[PDB]
Amino acid sequence: VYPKALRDEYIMSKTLGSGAGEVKLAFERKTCKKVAIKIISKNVETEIEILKKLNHPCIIKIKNFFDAEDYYIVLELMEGGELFDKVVGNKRLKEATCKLYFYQMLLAVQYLHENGIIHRDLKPENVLLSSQEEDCLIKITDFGHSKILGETSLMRTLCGTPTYLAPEVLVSVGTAGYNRAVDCWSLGVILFICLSGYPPFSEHRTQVSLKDQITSGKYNFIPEVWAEVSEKALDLVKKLLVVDPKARFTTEEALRHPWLQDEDMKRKFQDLLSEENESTALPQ
Amino acid sequence: VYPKALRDEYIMSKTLGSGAGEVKLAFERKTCKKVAIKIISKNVETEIEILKKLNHPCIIKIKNFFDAEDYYIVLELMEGGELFDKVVGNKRLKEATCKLYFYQMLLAVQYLHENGIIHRDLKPENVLLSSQEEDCLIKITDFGHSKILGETSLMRTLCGTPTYLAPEVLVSVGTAGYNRAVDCWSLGVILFICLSGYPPFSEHRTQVSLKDQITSGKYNFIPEVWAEVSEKALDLVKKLLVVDPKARFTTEEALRHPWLQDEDMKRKFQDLLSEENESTALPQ
């Protein structure tokens, strides 16, 4: 059965998704409104803490949380489902739809990085759509692998004289503080899949191992699928799939790329934000 | 003033050491025995947790702990003081004394590594002597930078398909799980200083930066100080000061080195253990 405290505030209904994890439709008794309830079989409390602090329109908000039994996380309903379903089976989005979605993922990830959070599991399964219409708001979800940046053990070590410090610690200094770049690589892979309908690194019809494809940065380019995709879109993809994390595009540099200097798309985004927002009277 | 709970069980006395940190002599009221009390100005509770679990004769034991005000950690008195004082000002130990001390540090560090703990701050300041005699027991102290090994974020990542995984994560696989090797490097530096009276990497009379000395592994060899030190001792030092952490000697390999196959030293250690041990009658 469901826990008593949950049943007290919500009525449970049908299944919406089935991860590995389950998501259910429920109604909040007090308001009679639809919510979604993520059930996780039993750092989930830390994921909750992270998600209570975050406030961005492209990031999922927690409405409630119960620790049974199992963990139950109540959130806003995203009737559009996962982005994954819009890209599976070589289905692909129109270029204008990718730009809208991608702009939102960048802003979301940018906001995470400004606030010392790395997501570490960005993929189409973790991007949710606000409605069944192609032009909609998306929200990033699933902070189970996320990581809070802060004062590292490395920084504390480098305040003393390194008389006793091992060489590998000193060499790691050259590349520390670039952990966030794994989110930018993931965005690059997501963008690729969105624009093309297929993944860049895959074991389908190759003898190069997946690992060797990824560490060399040699993505599977099929010229006849990309023919109808602009050059600007492909150019952004290439600056995100750069193997050196220090040379890879950050969220900032991706937001300044020619492909995202599209004032139609930005207006379409601003207007979607207003549609979502229903709140109080202002002075004036 | 001192906290009431501490004053309740102990009478405070003179200062023994003054770190950066203070260590005081105290008497336990119940037994009238001398103890040492480390005062740390306010993961110290985690250091306490680590040190309550550990049980090895060459590792410091906690007798009590109070969280004021400041933190107060009660421990066994080590009348011999820090190893640092026996090696400062180019003073050096006899080769037989280094072997005795070093054997103990290896066993201590070995035991830490078997139990998933990396110390990360081994230095002569953190090695304590049981008595003012040259032949004595030593104990490792100060677990403030220590680290509990466990199921890494890296291991969890490699259970899925790396479709979305960045190249730097896959490259880090080659060298992960060697964090403990920083303790073996530190032991190498400590041994060097003990056998020679001077540090291997230093800014004294050089133009090579400290960092460049350490990452190249080019220690300062002064032939006329080492002349009186055996070849076997120097050979062990060289296998610990190896820059590649994967090729560096572990505690196990150092314990099997010809320099530590000295049955006189091991007997002298076993007999010191018996001197320390005063406890209950046995069957038979």
Ligand SMILES: C/C(=N\NC(=N)NO)c1ccc(NC(=O)c2cc3cccc([N+](=O)[O-])c3[nH]2)cc1
């Ligand atoms: C926070 C979180 N997971 N955290 C975690 N540690 N997972 O392991 C989490 C993961 C997934 C979701 N998914 C949804 O809210 C979600 C999935 C889905 C599918 C069809 C339809 C809807 N829908 O609301 O219409 C859906 N909502 C919501 C939250």
Ligand SMILES: C/C(=N\NC(=N)NO)c1ccc(NC(=O)c2cc3cccc([N+](=O)[O-])c3[nH]2)cc1
């Ligand atoms: C656990 C710990 N420190 N932990 C920490 N986080 N430090 O920052 C710690 C550090 C140092 C010591 N030192 C001693 O017990 C200690 C130092 C010393 C000097 C002269 C003489 C004696 N003595 O007992 O005769 C001494 N004992 C004892 C504990």
